[PDB]
Symmetry: T
Subunit: 159 residues, 12 copies
């Protein structure tokens, strides 16, 4: 296909591709974080078992929803969503966290991971605002407000 000044949804192509690149790095972080959270669910031991087995599942279920919506936003911008483990490991800032078996280590892992997601989502929000990409802005807004609330709760548990 020939390059076009505007994409199918009527946004500037260059600016949309920059946004999609940043969204793809975000998606990489989500994917590694989701995997870590699945591990937290599986591997928890001790008297927090039932509570946190269930909490971690709630948390990764909500991440999975976001992963779906994020890949769709990338497609919506006429860009390619990263869709391999190898690709995600190359791009992610969040590290693989394995053999976390205690509530506090897993919960702190979540806090630290969400702190990266929030930071990256605020940067994307700002960039999207600069060019009037309201669809991308709106998505980041939703993610930020939800995850700020969650970060409050996780930190409350850890006090």
């Amino acid at each position: 296909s020939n390059a076009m000044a505007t994409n199918l949804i009527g946004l500037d192509t260059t600016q949309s591709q920059k946004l999609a690149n940043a969204l793809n790095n975000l998606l990489a972080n989500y994917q590694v974080f989701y995997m870590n959270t699945r591990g937290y669910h599986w591997n928890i031991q001790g008297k927090e078992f039932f509570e946190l087995h269930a909490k971690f599942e709630e948390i990764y279920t909500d991440l999975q929803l976001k992963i779906d919506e994020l890949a769709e936003r990338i497609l919506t911008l006429s860009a390619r969503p990263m869709h391999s483990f190898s690709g995600y490991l190359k791009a992610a800032q969040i590290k693989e966290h394995t053999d976390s078996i205690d509530g506090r280590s897993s919960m702190q892992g979540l806090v630290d991971g969400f702190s990266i997601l929030l930071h990256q989502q605020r940067d994307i929000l700002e960039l999207a605002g600069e060019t009037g990409d309201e669809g991308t802005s709106a998505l980041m807004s939703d993610y930020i407000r939800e995850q700020e609330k969650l970060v409050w709760m996780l930190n409350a548990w850890l006090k």
Copy 2:
């Protein structure tokens, strides 16, 4: 009633009436587009019949929700929503599209119509932002993000 500087919801009257005028032109486009989409539903033939009879119904059902919310926003701004076929035909940019019986013509009709809605919604969003009409902005934001996603899907089908 005497003219007032601010309307019942506490927004500037003049600016609200300008926004309502633009919203009413949008509503006209929605109404003609909805009608076209009902036609697409009724008149589809060939092996895409079941799939697209159902898809077109999904699409016009979602448009009807938006039409409802848009007329209510106009009322909320203390303005009059256009509420006649004659009025809508005078104001709409989207043309009446009749006797579309094939999937591709109908699907392309949708793409082209949504492209007008998105363009008009972005203009309204910008105007609303200029005066701090957050309620109107928020509505446009919702419509844009949803319809961008749909435009991606429709164009995917057409590839």
Copy 3:
């Protein structure tokens, strides 16, 4: 090569019935739009009650519109599907800027009276030509709308 259509009915009578059904559809469409207007524009202490009631009514009209268009298709005919087409064919007039409960409610009685008369004429034609599927549709619409006209009129007493 055959005097009958896809579903096995006489083609000429089916086209005659489809034409009548299309004129009925035009009336429904203008009527539905008027009713949307009644819903949006109602003011005064009847606001919540009638905002809800008018929504119930136009919702039910919408479903009937669906079924009518499909009945026209079922008779191998073309359903009208444009505002410009409906305005040319409809007897029911556009009714705008009705903001008072009694105005709007009387409008509904007046429109359903037109629909009922039209539906009865179609029912008679369908019955005498053996189009039971069209007759049955008209029967459902008539019985439901007679009940509704009783209620609307009751409210207006």
Copy 4:
């Protein structure tokens, strides 16, 4: 066991038995048609598989409900509903249609079967009207109105 002028529901015995006989011939046709449609469901192949495996299930599910009601109407007229494969095969006009594995063959088989059913139901409706058997008439009216709509859809797919 003594012959009676009127049956338990108060209709003429002779006229009701004639109607029951015609309804039993209808039931025979439904049953072979149902079996054929089950076959269409099971045997479809190629890219229409998911869509038509589902659509054929919808269709035979609806036929099954009509078979139930028809048999009960025959019982309601104080008559014996046919209830054996061998009986149905003797009485049915609709033939067994096996090894239909493509959409068009199966869909055309449905149009052809419904065409027979419609004709037969109209004949029963007319007979029932002659003697005032409203309960039988009303059943035929329901079946005709629903199957006419279906035939429109099936034919649309085949265009």
Copy 5:
């Protein structure tokens, strides 16, 4: 001017409304009888028939509501007192039926009357083009014919 509110002939509609009111009286006495069957059943059929009688009177109650509303729709007054119903009904009050067969036979006999009356109303409505009334009768007849088959099967 020549028709009632719903566009039908006034004289014909009043005649139909009168017949429907007599029908309503019969339904009301029958419903009461069936409540009694529900309450008073004894024996090993208790659970099954206590439930079955409730199902039957529940369906009658729905029909009663629709009948009254059809009368109102025809611009007539639905009878709405026990004393009015007792004057108009053909179905007799049936008390102290405690046996499954007695109560079930009672239902068969009562439905016989409803079906007969409904068929007469259907015929008259058809004659005069009152499709809304015809359609109601048609629904009631087809449902009750089915029920009469079932009740009689139980009694065999």
Copy 6:
């Protein structure tokens, strides 16, 4: 059929029959009241039509449930519940109230009827307490508490 000192539920036969007689008089009042309220539902006209057609249906629906329970309480006491219109008309204090077509008339009819029911239920409650018939007492307690609330609401509407 031999008279017994105690009934099947283990209460005194004589005292239970006296309670059953009072409950039957209550049932007679409920039944006439229910019929009146059905009439109010059917016959309302004017601008209260939708609101009161609905409210009267709610009210008679609740009465019907109480009629069911009362009759079953009478049976539970090994007594015969009245089950004929002619019986109810002989025993009821509440009179037939026909051709009530306006909100105030019908709503005042409900206040007046419930006032009779409340008085009667309180008398039965007191009698049941005298001999320890807790099952009857508990039924009256439920009916009183619910109908007092209702009377407040009906009277509020009438102000």
Copy 7:
């Protein structure tokens, strides 16, 4: 200081808790008997009674839970072993009841005992102002009185 955790008299509450525990023992043996009725029924009443017995034991199980919790609420220990229940119960173990009438009569007789015990507890709770216990008894009595009417109607 003068009352237990919930503000009632300690001695009175212990007396009520003891009676409630004896009640619990009876419910538990009765529930077991009713499970057996469900499992072992034979004959043409199989489907109806297999279902009806399940309904009855399901409701008993709910009452068992509430009883134990009321005992706990009174700061007492609910009995919670088969051996304890067998020592305390008046209702006897009923095994190998395979006939509808035998099992249904068994239910009538068992409920007779529950109702008697519940009425005694109600009286004592009323005397001492234990409304929470009174209210529980009231609910159980009214429900079971109804059931006893139904069971006996079936047996007529």
Copy 8:
């Protein structure tokens, strides 16, 4: 002209009971607000468990508040319906900045103990004057809250 009120009860006794019920309502209202505070402010590893539990509890209090106000109305009396009114009448004190599970849980035991005592006094008055509808309400509240106090206390052991 009559010593009795709309619902047929003695007016003097009904006003006495309504006054007591209003003081009960005041206590409920302050207690509900404290419980909202417990829900918002809990910290530590009991966070999710108690955030949920405190919500369950104040939700149930809210429903009881509804019903109490309506019972007061039903007795032809005026339900208190202002914060300033509740603070003047309540015995239960405002309890703020409770961030620890045991603090908050013990607060709940302490408040329900006050409610139970108050409800028992009303129950007794209602029973001796024949106000069965008020008695019945109190009965429901007492039985439910005795069970709850058992549970809360159990958690604290």
Copy 9:
């Protein structure tokens, strides 16, 4: 290359598919018989058995669908005509059964055949490692064994 689409032995799968087709023929004749039992029942068992027969044929229909699909899964052709079924079935057409015991006995005898055939198929599938077919048989056997206990309890 050595296996069918799902990775099983072709010859073994065709042998299993043949047996499953004979099973399908039996289910289809049995289902038809059970529809007849539902329609034709008379007497005081009418409501209970009209319902019970419907429950039983509903469950058979589900099994029929799964059987045909298992045959297809094994790359074979499911029989799909009445004339094919009548040629293959061992269960005979049973018409004009109007009595509860006759129809219930009919069900017992038919399930006897299904269970026997299912056990043979299970054994063969186990021998050849066709776990998917084994698992289907296992489910059908366990369900139908339970049902046979219930049907026989009713007949006692």
Copy 10:
């Protein structure tokens, strides 16, 4: 705890505390308004009783949802939500409104109260925008758009 430049969710501490202060004043207004609306529900008399008893309940139910979300946003900003009647009475602008028994007085009370909420929410929205507090902005946006719609409806009723 030592003062920190940024809070747990990664926002500037000082700016977040200013926002939380404004949010707490908003919460005070909500709480007094909710209480007033409960009074409106309880105390309504006359023929609007059923309609407005139900409407006022809808309205206070929706306020309660907002109160919950607002206190959680304050916590999310690492601030203390006001949680006493005394505190709310000190901070609120909306006055206690008691003994409102007529539809128009209660409905006007609602209009006037919502007008304060909207005004305060727009101010908070603006402040939050100035520092990029998107989570707070998004909440205000939701509240404004919903309450503007409601204000339209309430004023419609009052016309």
Copy 11:
């Protein structure tokens, strides 16, 4: 009542009775275990109260369903299921465990009980396999797979 070579389901009578005897011993163990677990539910105290009052209810609810199915399997084999407390106490290996009021004691009691049940079920599975009793085998397979998972969870909590 005459002894038969095969039972009603068509299996060997002798082998089925041996299996029924082993299943009855299993049922005895389930019943004592269930009673113990009910006790754990009722008697828990301390800060695990809400979590374990709920978890123990889940566990005994599941046991109850298995008790139902086991008894019915025994009946299906034409055998008499034990159905008395005194019978269960004679046959059970699992002992009565009363006055368990702490999480660890109760949770360890569950591990110990399930360990007995698993061993017993494996023995029955093996016996059933010897003679081709697939229906009994399949029941044991379900119980084993579910209880192994449970034991993992209970042990995790205890770490």
Copy 12:
């Protein structure tokens, strides 16, 4: 001190089975990711049908992943829980940029063929060592996936 594990099975055989199950899990994980890709990247007139179908399929894989990991835990073993671990162990290769229905559908057939073979080997090992819980899991997966492979293949004919 014992040759058996927490759930009563032989520790050595349980570790052998857990290792095989972990390699199965690795395959599932790569396969699930490929299927997500198929869902996101499909284009052409099969878009809606396959976007839905691929979602149904990866949803079902996700549940199986859950259960597999838990079965590994149940055997007192460690489930692999990192992308890097799965890529080292998986036989199924990453399959990216599949935008055509037939490509993606054939990919699914090819992957399920690998899973089925692997599951059959585990089933055999579990059966011969008496691990009925593992055998049962494999049985469920095999029967469901054989049916799915029939359907997918049918679509491709």
